[PDB]
Every structure is written in structure tokens, then in C-alpha cells.
Amino acid sequence: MSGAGSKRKNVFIEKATKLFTTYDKMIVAEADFVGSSQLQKIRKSIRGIGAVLMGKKTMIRKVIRDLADSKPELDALNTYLKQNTCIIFCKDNIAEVKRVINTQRVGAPAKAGVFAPNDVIIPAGPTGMEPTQTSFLQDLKIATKINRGQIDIVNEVHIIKTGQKVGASEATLLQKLNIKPFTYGLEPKIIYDAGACYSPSISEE
Template sequence: MGKAERAANRRGYFSRLFKLLSEYPRLLIVSADHVGSKQMAGIRVALRGKAQVLMGKNTMIRTALRTKLGEMPQLAALLPLIKLNIGFVFCGVEPAEVRDIIGEHKVPAPARQGVFAPVDVFIPAGPTGMDPGSTSFFQALGISTKIVKGQIEIQNQVHLIKQGDKVSASAATLLHKLNIKPFEYGLKVEHIYDNGSVYSASVLDITDETILTAFRSGVSSLAAFSRELALPTAASAPHSIIEGFKYCAALCLDTDFVHVR
């Protein structure tokens, strides 16, 4: 690729990024580790009409954002997030809906040597389908086995790989022999950008019901606190009135006093 062609591609990328930033005030910053081109194509198709995915080299993204800071200073919030293997998903619908669509496109993957395990990996107890000639392989890994009906059977569930540990060659080989694909890979939402503000991806788990439950809990706590202090508030007044009526009714019963209500 010649210098002129690279410059043209760069201008084209900048133009597309700026257009998307002006059209979509909300975007997801996603990590794309271990995501293949076929998988990415499937995600783009699923998001059609709802969101647009833009990947690119970090250096190019940073350069593009810096050239736009004069017009859109709020983009400065994105600069610290441009690291490792990231991309942007520009949201035309609610970010939570986009996140859910992305989550539906994870694919099972084998454990490859040297990869850091994203989850704990367990091998269940039971038959393996492997012949007795492979017994020494299990012994080298410290896995207790026995021979049942001409095949190796694992006696107890094995915690083969801990989350965050590197996958060893022997562990990767064993999982391959057992045809176990313990990992799932896909785009992972790391942050949300909304008109210059950046939030953790966890805010997408906050629903209307979550907010309502928290509000109810707050009102209940305020009412209890107000009653303890004998300080009438909008939250405590209904409880105080009901309690006062109960005391009044009890007093009337004790004194045989009849009241209208």
C-alpha cells in the first residue's frame, strides 16, 4: 500500500468516525479479544438498523479524537479508554438492548496454551471415552481415574484451570482430547459513553425495577428514622397517623367511650 493510499484510508476512517460521533451521542466501548472476522460479521448483521460497529488501530483513533477536540471537547473523556483491543459500538437504540444483542453472539472456544482463563474450568466425573493407554497422561496431571468397561473414567470432578491462570500445554491437550470447549468469546462491553460522560458497563444492569426498589427502601428508612426522632415528614406521617388512631381506638375501648369513627 502506497503512501497516498494510506493517507486516503486514514481520511476515510476519520470522516466515518466523525460522522458517527455527530450522529450517535451514545456509544459502547467494547473489547474484542479472540473475536474472529466471521463472528464480527455476524454481530454487525445482528445490529443492523440498531447500532454500528467501528474498529480501528488505537493510534489512529486517538489521533482522530484529538483533531476533533476543538469542536467536541467532550470527546476527551474517551481518550483514556483507548487501549488494548477495543472498538466502538454506536447505539441507535437503548445501550442495554445493544449489549444484549452482542451477548447473544458469543461462541464456544477451545482452551489454547498460554491464554489466560476467563473462567474456572472443571472436568466432570465420569467416562471419558479414552482408552486405557492414556492413563499415564491423567496421572501426570494428578487426576484420579479408573478403568471401566475398557475406557478411562474420572473418579471425581477436577478443577483443572483457575480463572486468571495461564492455560498449560497439558491442560489444553486434555481438554482437546475430551472435546471440551470451556471458554466463550465475543465483544465485551467495558464502558458506556454518553454525551461526554463515561460510565461502567454495570450501569446497564440497572432497570426501572432496580430504581423503584431502591426508592422504596430509601422511603422506608426515612420513615423509620423520622419516627424515631418524632419528626413528622411526608414519609413518616401516614405511619404516625395510623399508629395514633390505634392508640386512640385502644383508649376508647378501655374507657367504654363510643366515637363516630
């Protein structure tokens, strides 16, 4: 084929001329690796402050929308764009913009080849019984899955916790588990006012 993704462009020309950069605060956010199903529910105060906007073909064309403002073109001698990264325009204060996305956040399920931190409890419900499942749970510390009047092969409380994070060893034991609600929020690429740039943050500073 021959095009852009796999078809020629007629709406990505409009992403540069989508708005004027009237808003004084922007931030590069990594909300693409988290899924679109959960991404639309957390964003209610996230849109109305400037919205989640702009394409990633036009992220290089973004430079003509910084010359209008007092902002320099690059953020801190680098645009910081080597990832699925989108711009979120904000009207919230200099301290509030540091935690604008993390105020309402949620993660996606853990994939093959990565563990990810699991802070929230795992779901429950009737899923039969399996004796071979107990042999795989011997690697883990808790070897008990049947709880209460119901019967099932996974617990109602998270056994996978922070501290057990690794590259690729205990990640195979999560494929034995039948459900993956791995919460680690969303990820700031950088924080930025209108001239000065900062590192990713969760606090007011």
C-alpha cells in the same frame, strides 16, 4: 519494508470521514481477541443500530468527532485505548446500551499460557482409544472418557469448570484435551452515554 501495517495507506484516511457521529451512544468494545469466524454470526442486531465501525489509527482522530456533539473529547479524563479496541455506535436506550454486545455473545478457544472459564459442554464423536490419555486425566478429578456405544478419548460433558481458573498450572491439562470451546462472551472496555462514563456492565444498571 515501509508503510503502515506492511503497506502504505489509501483507505484508512476514510475511517475518520466514514460517517458523522449522528448517534448519541458509543461504546469501546474488546471483540478482537475473539475470532472473526464467530464474530460475524452474533452481529445482526449489533449492526443496524449504528454498526461496528472506525479504525484504531483513527481512534485518536475520533476526538474531532466528539466536538460536533455535546460529548467531551475524552470519556472520563481518559479515552481508554491501550488494547485492540473498536467503537460501536448505538441508538439503543440509556439502559439497553449497557448490555448491547452481551445480548448475543460467544467466546474463542483458550490459548497457551491461559486457562479461561469453560461454561458450555465440550463436543463429542468417534476419536479411537488411547491408554496414555487416562494417565494425564489422573490430575483432573474424572478419569473416564469412554461413554455410550461409541468410543473416544474425550467426554461429551465439560469436566473443566469455573472455580478451577488459574494463571498457568491446569492450562497444560487443556492441551491434553483435543477441543477447546471456551465461552466467555465479549468484553466491554467501558460504557458511555453522551457526557457521563461508567464501568463495564452486563446488567441494565
